[model samples]
Target chain A: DDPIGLFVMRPQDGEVTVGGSITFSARVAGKPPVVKWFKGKWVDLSSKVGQHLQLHDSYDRASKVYLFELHITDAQPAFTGSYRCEVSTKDKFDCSNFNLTVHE
Target chain B: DDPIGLFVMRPQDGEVTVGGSITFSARVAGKPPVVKWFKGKWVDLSSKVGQHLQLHDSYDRASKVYLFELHITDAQPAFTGSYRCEVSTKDKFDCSNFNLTVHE
Candidate 1:
């Protein structure tokens, strides 16, 4: 599997109520590689990130291409800075830095 | 933290040409718990399973609620089975199993 491309997160910068959802995507070259979300440090997005981060696993059974959905909620100033979406294959790995700017 | 509620998924059965996406959600009580996807044998959803499962993490800062979005793509007959959504809090865990039926 050849992993190439960046995970694009929409509204990388936004201002909403403290419970809205932020949508993100991972677009790669040879079909969308497997996408996952990481918080603060390099970490698998668990349920602790609040109700803002949504996880979706998109699969293509025939082609077997995977894409990921990442979210963030409850806007806070500290919740800013690069949230990483690491896309990878067997031997290939690529990532994107999403600067999430929140407001009160 | 109290864990009470069921993870709900829609369109549990369907038929697609191929290369399509299935949208599902994990709804829980006491705020949505963290959501994760597993394939085959209750394994962590890695990029190994083709491009069909999309992951999203939803967070609510003030409320500190977490919800999950799980996706599946590339419809196939063999790709049909009971997909599980396991959610947990400090001392509680709940799960929902959905039957995925696909026809070529």
Candidate 2:
């Protein structure tokens, strides 16, 4: 099979200082598929409930687009690295990658 | 500085099938320090909002203990791995590790 194709929207690279926050987003059309965000490698991210990290999805009826996002608060230098969002549907696959740099 | 010191309560290893859930916990007394749970290595965990992964902290007045926990819902095989909870304070450091095996 072919690799994940082009995404409707790609998350932008971001840079922020410690104690800051950032939001990474990706979008697609039609019914939502299996989607997940990975910090590095293929490891799916796991968030602590009380923390500022959040996952979100939105749908635009007119545009028929489904959006997925990861919002993280209280940034730390350890968060500096690449991130990937992988998507899979019945007969289509897509993914996006972005980098986040957190400074002291 | 020394490594994270002894923990009051350590998380036990866990096992479950796909679609199940699990809770990993650690405890200590007095004021809570800066604590984080990492899937592997020292990478802090990040959660998707609206998802089952939860981060929690509870305090016991009578016992004067503080409890921290990570609750994950809708388990999958990819979630089977080692996890760590690291804690740090002004003059103290402590951490705990546990393994999770998810079956099909």
Candidate 3:
């Protein structure tokens, strides 16, 4: 059976220096899966901005959780919440959440 | 310096047959922080119901993620998230998020 994967990260719940970056990652399962990101109530991780966080689907022998990074380049409190990674499998689907926090 | 920490888990994002359970854990670093649970929209992990999830504050030398478990019994789609664990400190505070999914 294929191993199920999961994981997510909040961009430093504390405080970040200006221009500092926060990265998030998660490993998912399924033959062909798709991934998406949401800020809170709406989708926010577009293909353009998604690259900054880096969503790598490549298999890693050392790890089980598929990595989906969400780097907060221009961090803000508004970016806080439960960030979600909706993963769609061939016949099933699931999502993960990450809590973000920015301190001044 | 204080070592900041964060993490979270969503109740299985898939589908749950019924009478299922899920636990969430996170390792945080700070000068003794308080832990509180939230389901979504509003607070749900009140002490009355929180007892079912079995929220505890135990230290593990092997884990840095302050583990907080949320067991979902009679799981359903309505209890999905973005489960949050807000930690508060004297000077400042932060939180972590976990996405929950249920599978059939």
TM-score of each: 0.38, 0.46, 0.40
iRMSD for each candidate structure, in the order shown: 16.5, 16.4, 9.9
* Runs with alpha carbons beyond 4 Å of true place in candidate 1: A1-104, B1-17, B30-32, B47-50, B60-65
Docking class of 3: incorrect
Ranking by lDDT: 2, 1, 3
Rank candidates, DockQ, best first: 3, 1, 2
- Please provide, for model 1 over B27-76, each residue's C-alpha lDDT reduced to its tens digit, 9 standing for 90 to 100: 44444455556543345765545566667767656654455766678765
Candidate 1 residue-wise lDDT at A5: 23
Local distance difference test, per candidate?
A: 0.52, 0.70, 0.51
Give per-residue CA lDDT, model 3, range A1-104, as digits (tens).
11133223222233454446676655653244566766553655665464234444555556444454555666655555555555544444444445666655
User: What digit string (tens of lDDT, one per residue) describes model 2 on residues B1-104?
Assistant: 11123356767788888999988888877746667787765446754323768888888889988888888889988888877666655544445557789999
The numbered model that scores best in TM-score is 2
List the TM values for chain B, per candidate.
Answer: 0.65, 0.86, 0.63
For each candidate, the DockQ is 0.02, 0.02, 0.04
- Candidate 3: segments with Cα more than 4 A from true spot: A1-104, B1-17, B48-52, B61-65
lDDT of 3 by residue, B7-91 (tens): 3222233334546766565455535656677764355585537423566676556644445555566776666545555654453
